[PDB]
């Protein structure tokens, strides 16, 4: 998903995205240590490096 | 024949096929050089060849129903 | 329901009360043709294997429902049914027993 509005003071609307905070890091996927994008929230408590 | 075509020995069928094909060739050749005047043979020779391939196919299938 | 060698009476049309023998049948449009009945006069041109041509007085086909079989016992027109004799189906005459036709 992750679209929605930007709203003005007179309450106009323009469509707009919210992007995740992807950072490129080297994780240990199956086999090699590989570089990949993953969000900062996801490596808060999800996945080893 | 068309019953006991099935009784033929799977090389009589092979020679029968090419004899029938030479017969069809002569018929088509003399239809053009316009002396045939009995044009119904062509059709029945075609169907004979059809007969002859059909049984020779199905032997093959029964030949691999066992192996 | 009639066949090629039969002997019929015509029950409707210009020839009416006449009888005859059917001589062809044309079943996909239900038109028999009976000898002596419904004679046309065809204007036939000179053909390549013919003279100048005649008035050709031959029979025209008649619809099959204007014709009824004659009861072999009483010579009245009758409808037919089917009796099953030994796996074979025969026509019976609906006022009597069997009516035999091969020609």
């Amino acid at each position: 998903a992750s679209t929605g509005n930007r709203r003005s003071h007179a309450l106009n609307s323009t469509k707009r995205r919210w992007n995740a905070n992807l950072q490129k890091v080297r994780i240990l996927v199956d086999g090699k240590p590989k570089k990949v994008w993953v969000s900062a929230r996801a490596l808060k408590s999800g996945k080893v490096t | 024949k068309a019953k006991e075509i099935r009784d033929l020995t799977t090389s009589e069928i092979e020679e029968q096929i090419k004899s029938s094909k030479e017969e069809l060739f002569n018929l088509r050749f003399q239809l053009a050089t316009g002396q045939l005047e009995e044009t119904a043979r062509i059709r029945t020779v075609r169907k004979t060849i059809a007969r002859l391939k059909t049984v020779a196919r199905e032997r093959e299938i029964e030949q691999s129903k066992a192996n | 329901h009639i066949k090629k060698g039969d002997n019929v009476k015509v029950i409707a049309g210009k020839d009416k009360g006449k009888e005859g023998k059917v001589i062809a049948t044309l079943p996909k449009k239900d038109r028999v043709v009976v000898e002596g009945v419904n004679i046309m006069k065809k204007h036939q041109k000179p053909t390549q294997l013919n003279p100048e041509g005649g008035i050709l007085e031959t029979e025209a086909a008649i619809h099959v429902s204007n014709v009824q079989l004659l009861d072999p016992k009483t010579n009245e027109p009758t409808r037919v049914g089917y009796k099953f004799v030994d796996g074979k189906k025969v026509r019976i005459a609906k006022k009597s027993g069997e009516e035999i036709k091969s020609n």
Binding site: - | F25, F29, A32, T33 | -
Partner: protein
């Protein structure tokens, strides 16, 4: 193959004048090449073949009373004999 690849002879005044020499004109299957045509007439009519020329004839437009359409396309071979002859009529 070898007898489905020759289909018809062609009889015309031009083809007759070619048969004044040792040339014979056939209508052949439209997918064959000319080595196969040389080999097939040698197999069938038992002769020796000098050379064979070949040409494709396009489909031809045609009419029959508010029905329009095309002929079939033809592959015509013209084969020159070295020795022997062929008795079509």
């Amino acid at each position: 193959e070898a007898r489905d690849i020759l289909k018809r002879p062609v009889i015309t005044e031009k083809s007759s004048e070619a048969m004044a020499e040792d040339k014979y004109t056939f209508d052949v299957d439209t997918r064959v090449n000319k080595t196969q045509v040389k080999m097939a007439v040698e197999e069938i009519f038992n002769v020796k073949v000098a050379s064979v020329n070949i040409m494709n004839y396009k489909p031809k437009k045609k009419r029959m009373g508010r029905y329009q359409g095309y002929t079939n396309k033809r592959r015509k071979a013209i084969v020159t004999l070295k020795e022997g002859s062929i008795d079509l009529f």
